[PDB]
Amino acid sequence: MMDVDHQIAKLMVELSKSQDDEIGDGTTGVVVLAGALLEEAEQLLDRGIHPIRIADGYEQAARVAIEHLDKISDSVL
Amino acid sequence: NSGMNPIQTMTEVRARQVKEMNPALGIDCLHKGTNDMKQQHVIETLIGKKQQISLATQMVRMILKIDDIRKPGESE
Amino acid sequence: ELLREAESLIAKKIHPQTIIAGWREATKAAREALLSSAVDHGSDEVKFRQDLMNIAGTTLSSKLLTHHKDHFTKLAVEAVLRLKGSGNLEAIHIIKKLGGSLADSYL
Amino acid sequence: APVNIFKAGADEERAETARLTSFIGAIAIGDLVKSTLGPKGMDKILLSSGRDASLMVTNDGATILKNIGVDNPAAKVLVDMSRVQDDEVGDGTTSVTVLAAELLREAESLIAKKIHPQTIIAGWREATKAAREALLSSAVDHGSDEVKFRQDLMNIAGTTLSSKLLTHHKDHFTKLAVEAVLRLKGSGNLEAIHIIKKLGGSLADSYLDEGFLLDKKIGVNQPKRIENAKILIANTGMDTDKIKIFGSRVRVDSTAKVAEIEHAEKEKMKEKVERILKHGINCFINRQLIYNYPEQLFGAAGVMAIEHADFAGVERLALVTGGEIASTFDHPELVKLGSCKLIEEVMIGEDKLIHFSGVALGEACTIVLRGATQQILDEAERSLHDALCVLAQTVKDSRTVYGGGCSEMLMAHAVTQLANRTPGKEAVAMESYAKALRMLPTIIADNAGYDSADLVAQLRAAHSEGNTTAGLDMREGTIGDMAILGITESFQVKRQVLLSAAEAAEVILRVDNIIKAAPRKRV
Amino acid sequence: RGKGAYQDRDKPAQIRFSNISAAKAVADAIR
Amino acid sequence: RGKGAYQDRDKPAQIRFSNISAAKAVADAIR
Amino acid sequence: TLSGMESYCVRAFADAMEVIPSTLAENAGLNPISTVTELRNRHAQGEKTAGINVRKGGISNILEELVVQPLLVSVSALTLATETVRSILKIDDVVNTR
Ligand SMILES: Nc1ncnc2c1ncn2[C@@H]1O[C@H](COP(=O)(O)OP(=O)(O)O)[C@@H](O)[C@H]1O
Ligand SMILES: Nc1ncnc2c1ncn2[C@@H]1O[C@H](COP(=O)(O)OP(=O)(O)O)[C@@H](O)[C@H]1O
Ligand SMILES: [Mg+2]
Ligand SMILES: [Mg+2]
Numbered sequence: 001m002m003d004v005d006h007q008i009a010k011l012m013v014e015l016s017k018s019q020d021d022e023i024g025d026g027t028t029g030v031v032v033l034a035g036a037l038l039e040e041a042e043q044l045l046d047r048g049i050h051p052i053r054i055a056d057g058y059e060q061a062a063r064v065a066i067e068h069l070d071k072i073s074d075s076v077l
Numbered sequence: 078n079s080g081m082n083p084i085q086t087m088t089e090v091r092a093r094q095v096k097e098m099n100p101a102l103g104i105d106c107l108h109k110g111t112n113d114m115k116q117q118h119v120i121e122t123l124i125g126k127k128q129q130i131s132l133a134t135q136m137v138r139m140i141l142k143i144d145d146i147r148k149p150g151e152s153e
Numbered sequence: 154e155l156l157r158e159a160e161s162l163i164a165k166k167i168h169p170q171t172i173i174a175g176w177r178e179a180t181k182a183a184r185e186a187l188l189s190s191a192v193d194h195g196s197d198e199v200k201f202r203q204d205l206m207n208i209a210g211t212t213l214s215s216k217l218l219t220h221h222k223d224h225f226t227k228l229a230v231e232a233v234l235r236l237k238g239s240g241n242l243e244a245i246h247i248i249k250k251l252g253g254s255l256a257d258s259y260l
Numbered sequence: 261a262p263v264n265i266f267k268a269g270a271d272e273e274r275a276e277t278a279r280l281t282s283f284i285g286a287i288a289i290g291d292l293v294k295s296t297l298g299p300k301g302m303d304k305i306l307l308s309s310g311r312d313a314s315l316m317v318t319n320d321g322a323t324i325l326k327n328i329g330v331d332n333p334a335a336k337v338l339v340d341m342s343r344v345q346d347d348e349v350g351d352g353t354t355s356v357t358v359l360a361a362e363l364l365r366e367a368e369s370l371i372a373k374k375i376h377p378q379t380i381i382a383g384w385r386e387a388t389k390a391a392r393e394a395l396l397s398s399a400v401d402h403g404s405d406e407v408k409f410r411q412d413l414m415n416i417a418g419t420t421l422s423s424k425l426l427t428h429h430k431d432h433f434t435k436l437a438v439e440a441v442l443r444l445k446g447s448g449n450l451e452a453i454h455i456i457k458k459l460g461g462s463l464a465d466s467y468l469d470e471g472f473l474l475d476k477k478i479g480v481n482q483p484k485r486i487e488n489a490k491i492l493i494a495n496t497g498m499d500t501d502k503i504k505i506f507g508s509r510v511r512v513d514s515t516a517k518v519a520e521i522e523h524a525e526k527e528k529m530k531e532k533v534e535r536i537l538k539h540g541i542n543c544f545i546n547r548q549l550i551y552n553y554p555e556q557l558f559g560a561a562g563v564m565a566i567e568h569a570d571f572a573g574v575e576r577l578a579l580v581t582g583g584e585i586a587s588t589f590d591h592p593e594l595v596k597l598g599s600c601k602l603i604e605e606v607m608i609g610e611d612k613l614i615h616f617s618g619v620a621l622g623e624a625c626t627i628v629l630r631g632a633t634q635q636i637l638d639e640a641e642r643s644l645h646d647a648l649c650v651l652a653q654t655v656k657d658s659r660t661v662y663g664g665g666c667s668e669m670l671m672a673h674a675v676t677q678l679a680n681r682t683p684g685k686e687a688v689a690m691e692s693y694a695k696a697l698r699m700l701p702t703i704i705a706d707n708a709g710y711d712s713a714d715l716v717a718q719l720r721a722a723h724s725e726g727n728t729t730a731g732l733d734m735r736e737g738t739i740g741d742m743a744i745l746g747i748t749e750s751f752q753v754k755r756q757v758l759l760s761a762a763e764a765a766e767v768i769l770r771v772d773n774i775i776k777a778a779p780r781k782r783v
Numbered sequence: 784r785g786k787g788a789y790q791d792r793d794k795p796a797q798i799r800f801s802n803i804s805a806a807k808a809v810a811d812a813i814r
Numbered sequence: 815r816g817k818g819a820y821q822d823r824d825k826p827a828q829i830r831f832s833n834i835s836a837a838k839a840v841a842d843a844i845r
Numbered sequence: 846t847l848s849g850m851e852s853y854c855v856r857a858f859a860d861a862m863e864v865i866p867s868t869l870a871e872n873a874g875l876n877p878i879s880t881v882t883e884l885r886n887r888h889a890q891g892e893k894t895a896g897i898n899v900r901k902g903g904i905s906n907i908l909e910e911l912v913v914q915p916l917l918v919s920v921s922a923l924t925l926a927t928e929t930v931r932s933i934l935k936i937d938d939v940v941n942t943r
Contacts, residue, residue, distance in 0.1 A: 007146075007148070008140055011136060011139065011140060012136075015132060015133070015136045018132060019128065019129070019132060022128055023122070023124065023125045023128050025121070025122070025125050026125050026126065026128075026129045029129055030128075030129050030132055030133050033129060033130070033133040034133040034136050034137055037133060037134070037137045038137055038140065038141075041137070041141065046842075046864075046867070047867055047877055047878060047881075048867065048870070048871050048876065048877035048878055049878055051141040051142065051144075052141070052142055054141060055137070055138040055141045055142060058134050058137060058138065059134065059138070062130050062131065062134040065130050066127060066130065066131070069123065069126060069127060069130075070123065072101075073123050078170075079816075079819075080168050080816065080818075080819030080820065080821065081816065081819075084850065084853060106170065107174075108815075108816060163823065164706075165712070165713055166706055166712065166713075166820060166821045166822070167821060168819050168821040169821070169823075171819070262797070263797065263800070263801050263804070274797075275792050275793075276792075276793070276794050279792065292940075295824075295826070295938060296938075302826060302935055302936070302937055302938060303932075303935055303936040303937075303938065304936070304938035304939075304940050305936050305937075305938065305939065305940070306940045306942050307939070307940070307941060307942060308941070308942045309941070317936050324940065327942050328940060328942055328943065329942065329943035331943075371792065374789060374790045374791070375790060376788050376790040377790070377792075379788065425932060425935065427935075460921075460925075461921075461924075461925075462924050462925065462928050463928065631928075632924075632925040632926075632928040632929045632932075633929060635932075635936075636928070636929075636932060685788070709820050709822075711818050711820075772792075825938070826937045826938055829937050829938065829939055830934065830937045833933050833934075833937060837933070845868055845872075
């Protein structure tokens with residue numbers, strides 16, 4: 001329900017919509033996390049690191065976060 | 078948002094997950110006594126947090142792999 | 154007046170979620186004050202009709218019908234008393250006609 | 261007057277928007293400089309729209325209000341109130357602005373209580389009289405035993421500079437402010453302490469000069485340093501005199517007589533310099549400009565010549581050397597000369613300044629402020645000016661009170677003790693006067709980030725049973741004794757905060773009609 | 784004693800005179 | 815216990831990020 | 846060796862000192878990720894006169910390349926910049942003067 005005419009921030013709108021369409025609980029936390037990954041990449045951008053090299057480093061880092069999250073998980077419904 | 082300090086609270090919870098095996102250790106607003114999320118019954122879905130890390134990484138990859146903006150000026 | 158007192162808690166540096174959690178316990182205690190002080194009326198219907206005129210006398214006192222409580226209270230109590238059932242609030246058709254004073258109105 | 265309005269372009273309001281615009285415009289002034297009060301308050305940066313904006317950061321409340329240009333009519337009373345506070349005592353301009361705004365904020369709470377506004381004026385006059393006796397009975401005097409008075413003066417400068425940009429420089433700037441007024445040894449003229457701002461270096465590199473610094477360096481072919489010299493200053497014309505006869509021409513018959521007149525003009529200019537060197541001097545300071553013909557005469561005799569220092573530059577040299585102005589040279593036995601040791605030139609920030617090292621009877625100082633930017637030097641000059649003006653009046657009035665919230669709780673206790681001995685018509689207005697006095701330690705406590713709801717409650721419980729020296733400790737965030745920590749302020753500074761805010765809140769509360777006229781060239 | 788003081792600093796004391804002066808113009812128009 | 819809570823609902827937390835972002839543009843201009 | 850909130854700011858002070866070798870390595874066409882990392886490895890061993898060699902295109906001895914900087918240049922660049930940034934976090938309120 002915003003009038004943001006910015007094509008980068010429009011992708012944050014579709015990110016919160018895609019979390020609502022698939023799961024529907026973490027639409028707020030998926031925007032703070034995406035803004036946190038881009039804020040930490042700002043200091044890495046000034047050090048001469050390539051932006052695709054940061055993007056290739058995030059895929060190898062997010063793969064560890066998926067496998068570690070599946071350690072303790074149980075329900076008896 | 079709970080009124081605490083971000084350094085004084087995140088350093089204590091993260092240090093307790095290394096000295097022992099990593100528990101369900103988070104925070105809360107009224108804090109409910111201890112910081113154990115298993116005792117406070119703060120339960121979230123696995124596929125909810127799995128898609129939070131997966132979708133935010135792919136959206137960052139599409140806004141890091143861009144080096145040109147071709148927007149127009151005025152409307153007419 | 155709740156938000157005017159909440160504006161006074163701006164300069165006191167009170168967290169706004171503390172005011173929400175403080176008012177939820179305050180509203181829960183305020184429900185018990187009205188529930189324990191409520192006066193019921195079952196049988197002995199000669200005191201319930203006197204109680205109904207006190208309800209219409211309090212509502213019409215804050216309106217334009219100030220010095221008409223000797224007439225408009227009987228026009229409001231006996232209108233619902235002639236329903237003898239559900240409060241449909243459409244069988245009481247109010248017809249407004251010019252001419253005459255408010256004391257000339259009748260049921 | 262709104263109904264059937266008989267005005268051209270002027271508007272007005274009576275008792276509905278009159279007190280509404282007066283309470284909005286005065287609280288927003290006090291809430292503006294609310295964040296600059298206390299030893300942990302932040303500062304403001306003032307900027308214009310353009311056309312030589314000349315940004316000037318200030319923490320003092322008088323310099324903020326004198327440059328904003330408020331359009332509200334009732335807000336200009338609080339702007340003019342802080343201007344007098346800077347001109348009289350030089351401190352408490354921020355404290356008198358928040359206190360005058362908290363009185364009208366408590367008076368806005370008496371709008372819905374249907375209290376008559378003349379009852380609040382009569383209730384605050386009795387509250388101000390009870391608050392004068394609280395500061396007068398708690399004032400600490402200092403007569404003899406001067407080793408305790410010099411320690412008391414460092415607590416005054418340490419309290420004033422703690423609320424400014426000089427936070428972690430109290431080990432140096434307190435000695436630069438106490439010893440500057442201590443070298444005056446007389447009246448607080450507040451102009452013998454010439455502050456020179458030079459870029460380059462940190463604030464710790466600043467110092468108090470033992471002598472005196474000047475500009476307009478010594479001639480062309482004149483000596484730069486003379487040991488054990490006799491300084492004679494002047495305020496007379498050297499060349500192109502045109503001496504005091506308007507309507508006098510040189511009407512001659514031939515051009516050979518013009519060469520005799522212009523040689524006679526240079527002989528009288530030479531004879532004037534010959535009357536100066538009969539005193540036996542080595543340095544010469546003229547307020548006016550010195551041209552080339554007397555400059556060659558001082559250079560041939562080995563005499564310095566400082567030309568066109570300042571109009572107030574010869575006044576500071578007369579107080580630092582012990583001489584006189586001496587604008588007429590016809591009696592060498594009635595002209596007192598100055599005294600010095602070294603007139604060497606020093607270089608501060610790639611600029612050669614004339615250093616009058618080793619002067620006798622030096623009742624003048626020179627503070628060499630060095631900062632990182634020009635914005636720091638403009639702030640440190642006003643921060644030192646807010647510290648030297650209090651010490652110039654502390655030596656005239658040695659009465660001091662315990663600051664840091666301790667003086668405000670003593671004033672609020674005397675009002676609350678007499679609010680219970682009054683009938684209920686004026687007792688509600690006296691309780692609002694005591695609540696506004698407790699807001700001044702509440703703004704200081706909340707600016708640091710402490711629990712202001714509990715620290716002022718601990719101050720009110722302490723002052724209710726003894727503890728006349730208990731105040732707010734901003735170092736650790738607790739309640740401590742103000743006589744031990746050494747946080748004191750002057751009596752005349754704290755009296756002018758109480759008295760001027762009570763008089764300014766009396767004017768705005770008595771306004772029931774704001775009739776503004778039609779402005780010019782505003783369409 | 785004065786037995787109280789009721790300060791009334793509000794709007795409608797002036798609007799009440801506006802309804803009076805407007806109704807006087809109607810009665811003087813058809814006078 | 816939490817031992818207090820300091821609610822800071824005021825302006826200059828956002829203006830402090832404006833002075834940082836303006837000074838970063840000057841350092842990247844003459845980098 | 847410090848603790849509390851002071852230990853997180855000296856690390857922020859030390860990480861801001863690595864910008865000038867990151868600036869010098871990026872302007873020289875070298876990789877600034879591995880240049881500043883190799884410079885911290887040489888100074889940890891004891892090489893106090895190590896730096897960026899723009900002639901060889903790497904890390905070598907500075908005094909061999911005759912690159913001499915005075916002490917007053919680098920001390921006043923650290924003293925005046927720290928005193929400036931200690932005031933910008935203290936001076937923060939936008940007041941537009943009319
Ligand atoms: N009792 C609690 N204690 C601690 N944290 C909680 C508690 N309840 C909720 N939270 C946190 O609040 C967050 C709320 O996220 P939310 O905004 O609902 O995400 P989304 O926008 O995707 O629905 C969750 O990530 C959760 O970790
Ligand atoms: N060391 C300290 N301990 C406690 N309070 C202090 C200390 N230093 C200054 N203060 C308080 O900070 C306030 C600063 O007021 P200030 O803005 O200087 O007023 P003004 O603008 O009129 O000079 C003073 O009222 C004083 O009580
Ligand atoms: Mg009603
Ligand atoms: Mg002060």
